Amino acid sequence: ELSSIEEAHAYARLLELHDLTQEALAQRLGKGQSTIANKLRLLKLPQPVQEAIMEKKITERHARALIPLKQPELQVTLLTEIIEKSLNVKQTEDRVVKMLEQGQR
Amino acid sequence: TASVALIENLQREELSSIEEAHAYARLLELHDLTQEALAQRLGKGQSTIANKLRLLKLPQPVQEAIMEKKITERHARALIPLKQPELQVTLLTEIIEKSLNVKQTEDRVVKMLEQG
DNA sequence: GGATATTTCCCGGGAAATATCC
DNA sequence: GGATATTTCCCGGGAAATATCC
């Protein structure tokens, strides 16, 4: 078993080296393209977030919930709150939508 | 002492809920420890262990379905409320036939307790 | 049009909360 | 009173549904 970030870093290589479609890799791995794509999106998140995934301090779906907050600053601010308050994914997703509303004011 | 490390590895590696339960039982006979202390040693809760040990009381037909990976733990656990083995095995085959999930298996259970 | 990115939410493990037993 | 049995439901993986891209 490995970190979502490290699993993503792996998939990336395999898709470069074996000239596969995400679908064909997922079929080869026993997953869905959905799963693979979503994990590859994590490689675009801030390094501080990525390090928290590797250190097993946040979950995949925790980090994935931050992406909607397109600004790295807002992602890392919440990251530390999720750690501090020990927030779940459900209330992390809730927190996100409230910040996007505050931003649109 | 040696058999301990074996099961710890058979536990660390993936196994059937029935076989995980059969394992726990032995470990509690071998070190004579409390469910709490084993769970703490394994990194689980006593809750989890106790619930898995309850599966060893379910009908053999149900237990075989767990090992053969035809039903889930929570599928078999949902049958226990139906205290009669006959009613548990009747639903077992329906869950297989209709390919029912746990949510609608739990629902089915309550309806049979109302009927009986 | 196929591949890929994104949104939504179904699903059951498994543990917290609880009741019961010894 | 502690251990153990039982009930309840929290939790996030991960894939279906969907939108978007090339």
Numbering used by the authors:
A (entry chain A): 126 to 230
B (entry chain B): 113 to 228
What's the publication's text?
Using a pair of evolutionarily related DNA-binding proteins, each with a different DNA preference (ParB [Partitioning Protein B] and Noc [Nucleoid Occlusion Factor], which both play roles in bacterial chromosome maintenance), we show that specificity is encoded by a set of four residues at the protein-DNA interface. Like ParB, Noc has a three-domain architecture: an N-terminal domain for protein-protein interactions and for targeting Noc to the cell membrane, a central DNA-binding domain (DBD), and a C-terminal dimerization domain (Wu and Errington, 2004; Wu et al., 2009). The NBS site differs from the parS site by only 2 bases (positions 1 and 6), but Noc and ParB recognize and bind them with exquisite specificity.
To understand the biophysical mechanism underlying the specificity to NBS, we solved the co-crystal structure of B. subtilis Noc (DBD) with a 22-bp NBS DNA duplex. The diffraction of the Noc (DBD)-NBS crystal was anisotropic. Hence, despite the 2.23-Å resolution limit, because of low completeness in the higher resolution shells resulting from the anisotropic cutoff, the resultant electron density has the appearance of lower resolution maps, approximately a 3-Å resolution (STAR Methods). By superimposing the structures of ParB (DBD)-parS and Noc (DBD)-NBS complexes, we observed several changes in both the protein and the DNA sites that enabled specific interactions. However, a corresponding base in NBS (adenine 1) positions itself closer to enable hydrogen bonding with this Q173 residue; this is possibly due to conformational changes in the NBS site that narrows the minor groove width at the adenine 1:thymine −1 position (from ~7.7 to ~3.7 Å). However, the equivalent residue R186 in Noc readily forms hydrogen bonds with guanine −6. We also observed DNA unwinding that increased both the minor and the major groove widths at the cytosine 6:guanine −6 position of NBS (from ~7.1 to ~8.1 Å and from ~10.5 to ~11.8 Å, respectively), possibly to move guanine −6 outward to accommodate a longer side chain of arginine.
